[PDB]
Design an enzyme around this catalytic site. Structure first.
Site, mmCIF file in Angstrom:
data_model
loop_
_atom_site.group_PDB
_atom_site.id
_atom_site.type_symbol
_atom_site.label_atom_id
_atom_site.label_comp_id
_atom_site.label_asym_id
_atom_site.label_seq_id
_atom_site.Cartn_x
_atom_site.Cartn_y
_atom_site.Cartn_z
ATOM 1 N N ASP C 33 0.822 -1.196 0.000
ATOM 2 C CA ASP C 33 0.000 0.000 0.000
ATOM 3 C C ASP C 33 0.852 1.238 0.000
ATOM 4 O O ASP C 33 1.437 1.508 1.017
ATOM 5 C CB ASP C 33 -0.714 -0.006 1.325
ATOM 6 C CG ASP C 33 -1.782 1.023 1.393
ATOM 7 O OD1 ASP C 33 -1.794 1.853 0.458
ATOM 8 O OD2 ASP C 33 -2.610 0.999 2.341
ATOM 9 N N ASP C 213 -1.505 5.696 -5.229
ATOM 10 C CA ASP C 213 -1.833 4.744 -4.197
ATOM 11 C C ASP C 213 -2.120 3.302 -4.628
ATOM 12 O O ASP C 213 -3.250 2.958 -4.917
ATOM 13 C CB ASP C 213 -3.008 5.253 -3.406
ATOM 14 C CG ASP C 213 -3.276 4.401 -2.236
ATOM 15 O OD1 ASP C 213 -2.483 3.474 -2.025
ATOM 16 O OD2 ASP C 213 -4.262 4.626 -1.528
#
Ligand SMILES: Cc1cccc(C)c1OCC(=O)N[C@@H](Cc1ccccc1)[C@H](O)C(=O)N1CSC(C)(C)[C@H]1C(=O)N[C@H]1c2ccccc2C[C@H]1O
Ligand SMILES: Cc1cccc(C)c1OCC(=O)N[C@@H](Cc1ccccc1)[C@H](O)C(=O)N1CSC(C)(C)[C@H]1C(=O)N[C@H]1c2ccccc2C[C@H]1O
Ligand SMILES: Cc1cccc(C)c1OCC(=O)N[C@@H](Cc1ccccc1)[C@H](O)C(=O)N1CSC(C)(C)[C@H]1C(=O)N[C@H]1c2ccccc2C[C@H]1O
Ligand SMILES: Cc1cccc(C)c1OCC(=O)N[C@@H](Cc1ccccc1)[C@H](O)C(=O)N1CSC(C)(C)[C@H]1C(=O)N[C@H]1c2ccccc2C[C@H]1O
EC number: 3.4.23.38
Lengths: 327, 326, 327, 326
Positions: C33, C213
């Protein structure tokens, strides 16, 4: 006897009907929510994006409007609205009566749920103590000035768009139901919460408070209870969303059972399912979603109210149930 | 009157049960105002399609009256094989001697047959249309002083799991509302009528329009149709007689059926069928290209869901009303 | 040079890869992440439902574990995890290095997002100051002890589901892209936030921060901006959910345009759409959803990263972009 | 070799362009190893299905050699009408005198034709299959010392863009991988081959199996199939030759096709097509009931997507490999 706002239904997922405000009878569409207790409309005053498509109340061209001006958030779990209080004469059905309501001026706290809705405001239909501003419930106000026989109201909801639904005030009309009523006395006069040992096929929960809520599109159960529920019944949860999918005739789907002292209440799955695809095999959405509330607290919302005609009785602190006529 | 309780199946075909034999073997039947022969899978039908089916055994009923002539049933949707017979047919509680086909070769009529949940068809069509000149069952019942009128009603339910009705002997009040325009057959063949056929722009003046409960769908000339959908937003799914559109599609017109007396109209809400509803919602369209003699239209099920139908052997008419919506 | 965890992809909607923890090398699947900055695993210690199918880390049978024990909430917007900090030597790729991570013991705050996943924990790949506990970023840590050439990492995400994704540490491998890199300096070292004038067909927004992201399945935009967007392009929003449906070839669909001083970055709709129905007419999900965050802030999540190979450079404070190869 | 670039359309039919005339009128074509006549909509084709189509004007090409005999093409999926003609056909950069049908009446072949985005078909079957005995186009090219081999290849793509390849004159390396089993025709009619056909339990030993690029699907006997799907989880959508299942359906077997040399096999991943995928994924299945002479099976597009195909007039053989997956 009875007086009846007819309610239009959008994708089985919300219901709205007209009501008027002011002595120049300005028109509005409202969600009639037995799980909240204030009324509001867009204000001529409001300048947020969401307001701009709605019908805006003009405190000005009503001659019977009286000023108040005390400001208010209104915080549903669905979002927030904000305005100030005014007083005027609200007409529902064609029964007329003075009321305290909210001229909403900020809505950005409630969109897109509002920017994509086809209703101007909400009409609270619960009890006095769920109200922001200790305002009496509108059915109660109506009684208190000999406008109605009995301070009771009913919901009859149907099965899609140009099938018509019906909120009836101050009379229990036979046209809607069959069999006899069965009543349950409430356990607080807050929501139309009654009191139930629920049985969902495999797990039950002892004496739960059930909210009867015209406002919710869905049935709700606390989240521990649901994960505990769906396991093993081949229902796939679309990820990151309150969204449950299954084959329409998934024959592992239990009839839900609501059971009390007096009575038994049931929901076949044909009731808590949405058809989503229907081409030889039919796919369905399961109309039950996680929600954590005080007690073991379940909302029987729109799917339940579709099977069951419902009588809300301020005079007795009861909600009655009968089978809704299919015709 | 007297009605046979109709069973819906995907709104694509309806069936009803009716008894043949003194021993009263019960059967699943399609009631087809598009053909005028009665039939059943003989117990001597040797084709595997027959195997889940309800058979008629010419042994069990006393009344079984031997015939034996061989016969070919040539539906455009396939062909059957057998030989003629006779016995006491009953429809609801209406018993009567009739001659019919004992079906032994179902092979030229599957997969159609082997899927279908029906054993045979009954022709509600005319004497002219019959293979063997068998008088239409209603006209028999009449000339055996057994019911008031050589008439019947088709009440089809708008919607899938609800009941539907073949009433015989007289029009009923329950079934319909408003008045009841009539028009007259331009041949005592099919229940075919002469019709000013308007449909968006495209009329096709003085068309022949067959009423027909057997047909699940509405039809039109392959050419007049193809020309119609053009520019609407109705995509056709490749080499199947099938078309999808969104259900809210606003390009979609209502359909017109005007006569000397009157006008009838098909709203898009009557010729679409849902397939998918999630956010956008698509529907499949119930009009299909099929060519015959004139401008010849088949009004099938989508039309009869809207209009209660009365079929009049006596007054040579067909007559329609708004189906009591429930 | 580079070392690479190969990433598996479920429904184009999340990506996971293996890594090791402890000097007995206990294995786990993680979401990598670039929009959070902590590592955690389920603890041998965890007794919540969501743990029960996962690979639980046993602090005990690693002989190189050192205790910490300070307890931590970790609050994503997707949910909450809870546990305490431990120190052990984590191996990613097959690069080995000491770390502070979270033994997660309570997950009920993150389920079903966690009950329905096939990943044990998460690996944070952002910047120090997004970390709970001011913990150096893994890739940084690895540089700080001569395990890697340069403190840089890359994300190659595959088109459709099969065919395999890769994270590559400490080397920019030419196998993944074509053309040249175009770089963007970050505007805080928090997220991999760079700085962009975005242009979506009809509406533009001046100098937005864009967050790169890996963790997010979708593209996100502030809510006003979206409502303003979808209007008039016949995109229907399924009611009461962040869900947008349209016809796949809805030829009103604009190419998205991300534009900076150096460069122009684009996203054709064939990249921000998911099929759903292919029967003649053809239905698509639009992979953009309303999300409100500090500035005008957009997260370019998984859709973007499919068109674009991405280089995350700690040493320079930059994110670089090149066209990902299709093969 | 030499390939024509094939175009994909919904994986339901492929098309290519090839030129007819000295003036070189280019056309959209379906290359059908299931028939052996070539045709085009004549400029004299008067039917309204012709109007969006590419016409051949026997005026523009010098090389137009008049013939005129009248002729009926009776495909099982419809019929066309015309008269014969002759001119220089080109296939990729391959030019040659060939006799063909000028199509004037397309009415017995719509809606099929008027939707399709193709102007004519080319036969890639045998002389025995030809209406008029026109020698197959490849055997012509051959016997004009114009290519090495009376052979052709069929390479078929999976997705919508991704393009297909009818190669002529010699097998190519790029198109396939691994070896290449051959089998020999049990008639020089269709490219039909003798096959031990295995499929879950149901075999049907020594069947004839037609390879056919024209067909979008795979077909089998209506009886063997119906019996096949039973107890699978394969629902059939009512009176359309159409079946839905969930794509993960584990009751679904791989198909077997063994001969004396070798065995071939169809994974479910090859005969399914996604209809719907969201939470649950449903797939429509590409196998359809249609009856002929023997146990006769049509291996169509789903099979040719897996296996590259080599069509050998010379060695009387049909041969297969794994289609280079890209
Ligand atoms: C009165 C009050 C004062 C102070 C504080 C609180 C929390 C109060 O309660 C308010 C409340 O939120 N009231 C809700 C009831 C409620 C309370 C708590 C949790 C959840 C619901 C009101 O009845 C109601 O339905 N509603 C409300 S808005 C709505 C009409 C769209 C509808 C709703 O959400 N509808 C959506 C909904 C709701 C639940 C599940 C699914 C869906 C989809 C759609 O159907
Ligand atoms: C031509 C003739 C001459 C002398 C004598 C006879 C008996 C003749 O045969 C008349 C005839 O076959 N009649 C057909 C009707 C007909 C008339 C004219 C043209 C085409 C058909 C019979 O009545 C009938 O409806 N049917 C037949 S079977 C059925 C009940 C399934 C239905 C039908 O096809 N249903 C299917 C159908 C049919 C058409 C379009 C769509 C669909 C969907 C499906 O539901
Ligand atoms: C660590 C931290 C510390 C202090 C403060 C903050 C704000 C922190 O970060 C919070 C955060 O959630 N961070 C998210 C990123 C983020 C930032 C701001 C708002 C929302 C998210 C983290 O990157 C991440 O991707 N995630 C998180 S879980 C996940 C890896 C599966 C993914 C995610 O949710 N994915 C879901 C998601 C998220 C956005 C849009 C769509 C979808 C679908 C699904 O994929
Ligand atoms: C050429 C000839 C001359 C004299 C005698 C005979 C019997 C001849 O052959 C007839 C024939 O039809 N030949 C057919 C094959 C065939 C043989 C036997 C029965 C049925 C078909 C020709 O190959 C062919 O595919 N075709 C032809 S048209 C087409 C390109 C659309 C395609 C087809 O049908 N396509 C459709 C089709 C066909 C079968 C199943 C599904 C589908 C969907 C669609 O894709």
């Amino acid at each position: 006897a009875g007086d009846s706002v007819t309610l239009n239904d959008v994708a089985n997922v919300m219901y709205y009907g007209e009501a008027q405000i002011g002595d120049n009878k300005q028109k509005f569409a409202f969600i009639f929510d037995t799980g909240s207790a204030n009324l509001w409309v867009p204000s001529a005053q409001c300048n947020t994006i969401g307001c701009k498509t709605k019908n805006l109340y003009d405190s000005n061209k009503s001659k019977t409007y009286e000023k108040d001006g005390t400001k208010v958030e209104m915080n549903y779990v669905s979002g927030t609205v904000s305005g100030f209080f005014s007083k005027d004469i609200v007409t529902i059905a064609n029964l007329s009566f003075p009321y305290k309501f909210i001229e909403v001026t900020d809505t950005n706290g409630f969109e897109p749920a509002y920017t994509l809705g086809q209703f101007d405001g909400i009409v609270g239909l619960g009890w006095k103590d769920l109200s922001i501003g200790s305002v009496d419930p509108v059915v109660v106000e109506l009684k208190n000035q000999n406008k109605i026989e009995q301070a009771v109201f009913t919901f009859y909801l149907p099965f899609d768009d140009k099938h018509k639904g019906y909120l009836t005030i101050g009379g229990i009309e036979d046209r809607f139901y069959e069999g006899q009523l069965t009543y349950e006395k409430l356990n607080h006069d807050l929501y139309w919460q009654v009191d139930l040992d629920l049985h969902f096929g495999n797990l039950t929960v002892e004496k739960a408070t059930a909210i009867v809520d015209s406002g919710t599109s869905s049935i709700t159960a606390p989240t521990e209870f649901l994960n505990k529920f769906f396991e093993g019944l081949d229902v796939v949860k679309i990820p990151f969303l309150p969204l449950y999918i299954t084959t329409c005739n998934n024959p592992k789907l239990p009839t839900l059972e609501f059971r009390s002292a007096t009575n038994v209440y049931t929901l076949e799955p044909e009731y808590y399912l949405q058809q989503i695809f229907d081409f030889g095999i039919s796919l369905c959405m399961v109309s039950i979603i996680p929600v954590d509330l005080n007690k073991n607290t379940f909302i029987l919302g729109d799917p339940f109210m579709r099977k069951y005609f419902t009588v809300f009785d301020y005079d007795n602190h009861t909600v009655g149930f009968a089978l809704a006529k299919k015709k």
